[PDB]
Amino acid sequence: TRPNHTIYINNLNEKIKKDELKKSLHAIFSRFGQILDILVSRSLKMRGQAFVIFKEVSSATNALRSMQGFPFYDKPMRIQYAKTDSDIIAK
Amino acid sequence: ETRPNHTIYINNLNEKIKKDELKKSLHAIFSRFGQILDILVSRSLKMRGQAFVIFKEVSSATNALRSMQGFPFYDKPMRIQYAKTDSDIIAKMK
Amino acid sequence: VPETRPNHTIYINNLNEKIKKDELKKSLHAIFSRFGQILDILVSRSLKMRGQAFVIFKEVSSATNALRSMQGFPFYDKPMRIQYAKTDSDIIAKM
Amino acid sequence: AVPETRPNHTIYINNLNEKIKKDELKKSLHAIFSRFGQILDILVSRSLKMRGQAFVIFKEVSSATNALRSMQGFPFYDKPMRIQYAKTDSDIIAKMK
Amino acid sequence: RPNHTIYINNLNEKIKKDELKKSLHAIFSRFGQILDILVSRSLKMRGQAFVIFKEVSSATNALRSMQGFPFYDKPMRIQYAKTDSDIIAKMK
RNA sequence: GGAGCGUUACGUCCGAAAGUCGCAUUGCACUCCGCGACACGGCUCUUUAAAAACAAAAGGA
RNA sequence: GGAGCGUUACGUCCGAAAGUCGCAUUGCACUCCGCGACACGGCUCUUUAAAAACAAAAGGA
Numbered sequence: 001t002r003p004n005h006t007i008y009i010n011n012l013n014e015k016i017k018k019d020e021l022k023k024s025l026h027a028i029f030s031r032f033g034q035i036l037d038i039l040v041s042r043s044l045k046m047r048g049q050a051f052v053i054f055k056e057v058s059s060a061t062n063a064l065r066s067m068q069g070f071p072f073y074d075k076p077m078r079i080q081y082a083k084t085d086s087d088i089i090a091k
Numbered sequence: 092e093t094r095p096n097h098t099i100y101i102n103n104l105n106e107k108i109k110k111d112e113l114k115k116s117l118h119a120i121f122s123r124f125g126q127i128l129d130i131l132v133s134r135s136l137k138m139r140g141q142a143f144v145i146f147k148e149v150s151s152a153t154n155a156l157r158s159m160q161g162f163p164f165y166d167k168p169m170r171i172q173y174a175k176t177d178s179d180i181i182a183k184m185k
Numbered sequence: 186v187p188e189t190r191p192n193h194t195i196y197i198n199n200l201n202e203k204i205k206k207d208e209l210k211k212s213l214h215a216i217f218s219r220f221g222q223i224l225d226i227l228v229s230r231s232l233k234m235r236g237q238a239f240v241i242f243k244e245v246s247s248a249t250n251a252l253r254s255m256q257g258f259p260f261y262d263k264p265m266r267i268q269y270a271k272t273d274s275d276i277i278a279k280m
Numbered sequence: 281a282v283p284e285t286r287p288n289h290t291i292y293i294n295n296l297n298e299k300i301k302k303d304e305l306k307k308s309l310h311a312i313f314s315r316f317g318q319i320l321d322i323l324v325s326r327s328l329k330m331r332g333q334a335f336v337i338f339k340e341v342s343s344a345t346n347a348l349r350s351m352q353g354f355p356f357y358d359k360p361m362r363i364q365y366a367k368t369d370s371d372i373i374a375k376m377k
Numbered sequence: 378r379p380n381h382t383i384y385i386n387n388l389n390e391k392i393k394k395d396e397l398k399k400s401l402h403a404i405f406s407r408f409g410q411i412l413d414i415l416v417s418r419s420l421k422m423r424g425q426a427f428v429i430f431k432e433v434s435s436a437t438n439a440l441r442s443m444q445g446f447p448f449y450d451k452p453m454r455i456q457y458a459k460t461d462s463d464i465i466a467k468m469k
Numbered sequence: 470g471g472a473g474c475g476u477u478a479c480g481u482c483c484g485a486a487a488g489u490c491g492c493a494u495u496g497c498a499c500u501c502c503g504c505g506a507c508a509c510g511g512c513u514c515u516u517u518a519a520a521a522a523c524a525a526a527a528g529g530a
Numbered sequence: 531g532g533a534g535c536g537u538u539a540c541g542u543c544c545g546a547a548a549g550u551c552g553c554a555u556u557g558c559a560c561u562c563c564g565c566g567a568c569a570c571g572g573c574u575c576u577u578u579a580a581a582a583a584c585a586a587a588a589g590g591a
């Protein structure tokens with residue numbers, strides 16, 4: 001809701017495989033700043049969702065609302081801030 | 092409907108026969124009903140395969156209808172009927 | 186009853202009528218080929234010809250050996266009944 | 281003025297590689313020309329008339345204009361295509377006899 | 378990783394192997410001597426092909442020049458082919 | 470309602486063919502041919518037989 | 531038993547389990563993990579992966 005190092009993306013094409021998605025997401029979000037990591041899981045609870053962990057918050061914000069709705073594998077991205085800090089960031 | 096007119100409208104004619112040949116072939120088989128004033132033929136898109144026959148009298152035409160309906164003509168069976176309007180006619184011959 | 190006079194052509198019946206023509210015609214060729222050159226196999230599902238086939242051999246000895254070796258052989262759950270053809274097949278009389 | 285060439289739903293292609301069997305040539309032509317719109321037929325012949333040449337008959341005349349403009353000089357079997365609108369139906373029937 | 382061989386995908390899959398090869402030659406011969414075109418319609422190769430050029434020069438020009446080129450109504454991706462080992466595994 | 474249209478499944482050929490389930494049949498042929506039954510969206514036209522498009526969620530090889 | 535063989539339906543192509551369909555699921559983690567399906571006669575060899583052949587009563591498009 002409130003800014004954070006890590007952006008929460010959902011409404012993602014659930015049929016892309018974990019590895020292709022990460023690299024696709026990397027290509028289009030790396031222009032915004034350094035990506036620490038992208039978490040992807042094809043869980044029931046976690047499919048269609050990604051967490052991109054930026055090094056700097058400013059990179060996250062700039063990415064969040066400039067890529068909002070970006071068409072990606074034929075579905076518009078919905079991007080919001082993660083409600084908690086990612087583990088790597090709060091350690 | 093289609094009120095008796097001295098002009099008859101004919102179609103299902105073969106379209107390969109030349110205008111002028113078709114014209115006098117029609118003249119021969121239709122003169123035995125009355126004195127033709129004119130026969131209107133053309134192979135435009137909308138007059139090919141069809142013709143108008145104009146006698147002096149309406150009796151001539153009403154008789155050529157019934158006598159010559161289905162008549163085999165260059166291997167096709169003629170389809171005759173009365174002209175609808177002296178307008179439709181002038182509108183087929185552009 | 187049966188036709189015992191040797192002929193180039195054997196007449197099988199008691200065949201399974203549910204079998205399709207060219208499966209039967211080719212299953213027959215698979216089980217009879219080893220007796221000699223087969224000139225033709227004739228199958229017909231018509232009313233009076235279903236259930237039954239003619240296998241034409243080049244040599245009467247093939248036919249005899251085929252008739253004798255295969256009598257009663259179980260075939261699509263029916264044992265073939267085999268006899269000789271009452272008359273020659275046309276392919277034959279030419280020659 | 282110089283007159284604008286009259287469009288046609290059929291395009292005349294030449295400077296084609298004559299070493300290609302005519303039935304492959306059609307199929308390869310369909311591969312690069314179906315994007316511009318529906319093809320109704322492709323005309324090739326082994327007669328000396330049609331040597332190195334073909335006609336691609338489109339449904340819509342707009343499609344032949346896009347294909348003529350987009351694929352002019354396109355290299356095809358290592359030989360650049362020369363494309364023009366076909367003239368008449370009677371012209372095609374002559375070279376296809 | 379520039380290489381003798383290009384890997385084409387997003388190819389129309391409702392086309393027969395023999396024709397696909399001959400059509401891919403008609404459009405790629407311009408760039409160099411094609412040593413072979415590898416097509417197959419297996420679940421693993423369908424919609425894809427390998428084109429092998431004598432020289433790496435030719436695969437580079439082909440990859441850039443023919444990128445997205447519309448072909449059987451579909452625009453092709455041309456990527457560089459991986460290793461000979463990867464290729465032999467995709468054919469079967 | 471009735472006719473005409475057989476275009477369409479991967480994508481061809483059929484749809485007056487075929488296949489399938491019944492019922493009959495133990496039968497000697499060389500060209501076929503027992504009986505019964507079991508699909509199809511749409512578009513024309515209006516007792517006529519033409520016109521020109523067209524479906525795999527509907528049948529068979 | 532186990533490997534290799536994908537030839538076959540009208541008759542072409544296919545017949546990938548680190549995979550593929552189908553159904554569910556819009557879900558805030560830092561993590562294995564929703565549910566349901568994936569047919570096939572036979573040949574050949576015997577932990578080798580070669581070699582020639584081959585079925586629609588068995589799966590697709």
Ligand SMILES: NC(=O)c1ccc[n+]([C@@H]2O[C@H](COP(=O)(O)O)[C@@H](O)[C@H]2O)c1
Pocket residue numbers: 474475476509
């Ligand atoms: N579309 C056509 O050209 C065409 C022609 C004949 C039959 N059919 C189909 O066959 C079915 C039975 O045809 P009829 O009702 O014309 O005998 C129709 O309902 C129609 O679906 C279609």
Ligand SMILES: NC(=O)c1ccc[n+]([C@@H]2O[C@H](COP(=O)(O)O)[C@@H](O)[C@H]2O)c1
Pocket residue numbers: 535536537570
């Ligand atoms: N005849 C062949 O060349 C061939 C090859 C592969 C599979 N098959 C069929 O596929 C089935 C499954 O085969 P596998 O036992 O090789 O998985 C076999 O039982 C066989 O029916 C046949």
Ligand SMILES: [Mg+2]
Pocket residue numbers: 024072073
């Ligand atoms: Mg993308």
Ligand SMILES: [Mg+2]
Pocket residue numbers: 261
């Ligand atoms: Mg058996």
Ligand SMILES: [Mg+2]
Pocket residue numbers: 480
């Ligand atoms: Mg189709």
Ligand SMILES: [Mg+2]
Pocket residue numbers: none
């Ligand atoms: Mg058809």
Ligand SMILES: [Mg+2]
Pocket residue numbers: none
């Ligand atoms: Mg009918």
Ligand SMILES: [Mg+2]
Pocket residue numbers: none
């Ligand atoms: Mg209907």
Ligand SMILES: [Mg+2]
Pocket residue numbers: 508528
């Ligand atoms: Mg049926």
Ligand SMILES: [Mg+2]
Pocket residue numbers: 530540
């Ligand atoms: Mg059949």
Ligand SMILES: [Mg+2]
Pocket residue numbers: 531
């Ligand atoms: Mg054993």
Ligand SMILES: [Mg+2]
Pocket residue numbers: 536544
């Ligand atoms: Mg196969």
Ligand SMILES: [Mg+2]
Pocket residue numbers: 481482540
């Ligand atoms: Mg067929």
Ligand SMILES: [Mg+2]
Pocket residue numbers: none
């Ligand atoms: Mg067959």
Ligand SMILES: [Mg+2]
Pocket residue numbers: none
């Ligand atoms: Mg599962």
Ligand SMILES: [Mg+2]
Pocket residue numbers: 583584
């Ligand atoms: Mg064998």
